[PDB]
């Protein structure tokens, strides 16, 4: 199930098994939090997030956190939006540009050069059980 500890762990593993992501993020450094805004109806009254400890193409660790999460980059969105993105119904780069996926911490200037890594992060997420 999305945004659960089991998912976070399976995602980190999938990223480490992805040669495409590994190549795309070869020089990437920095943690990334995928945050879901509070949604009581969905069982996330305080919000939830998956925080990825990413480094040079690898995932050194992941974790699902209830509430606010700390990271070098934080991308926040409504659960429905994340469901669309992580399921391939919404393209991530355009979603970020329109603000559907909101960059809460970090700058576009710093993230722009890693657009392919972002595309791969999302493509890999889609393949997680």
From TrEMBL:
Domain named SCP2: residues: 13-104
Signal peptide per UniProt: none
S-S pairs: 12-59
Name under which the protein is recorded: SCP2 domain-containing protein
Origin species: Thermus thermophilus (strain ATCC 27634 / DSM 579 / HB8)
């Amino acid at each position: 199930e999305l945004f659960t500890e089991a998912w976070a762990q399976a995602y980190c593993r999938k990223l480490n098994e992805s040669e495409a992501y590994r190549k795309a993020a070869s020089t990437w450094e920095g943690s990334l939090a995928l945050a879901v805004r509070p949604d009581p109806k969905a069982g996330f009254p305080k919000g939830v997030a998956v925080v990825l400890d990413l480094w040079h193409g690898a995932c050194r660790g992941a974790k699902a956190v209830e509430g606010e999460a700390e990271a070098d980059f934080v991308i926040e969105a409504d659960l429905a939006t994340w469901q669309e993105v992580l399921e391939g119904r919404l393209e991530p780069l355009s979603a970020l540009m329109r603000g559907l996926l909101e960059l809460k911490k970090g700058t576009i200037a710093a993230l722009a050069p890693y657009a392919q890594a972002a595309q791969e992060l999302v493509k890999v997420a889609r393949e997680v059980a």
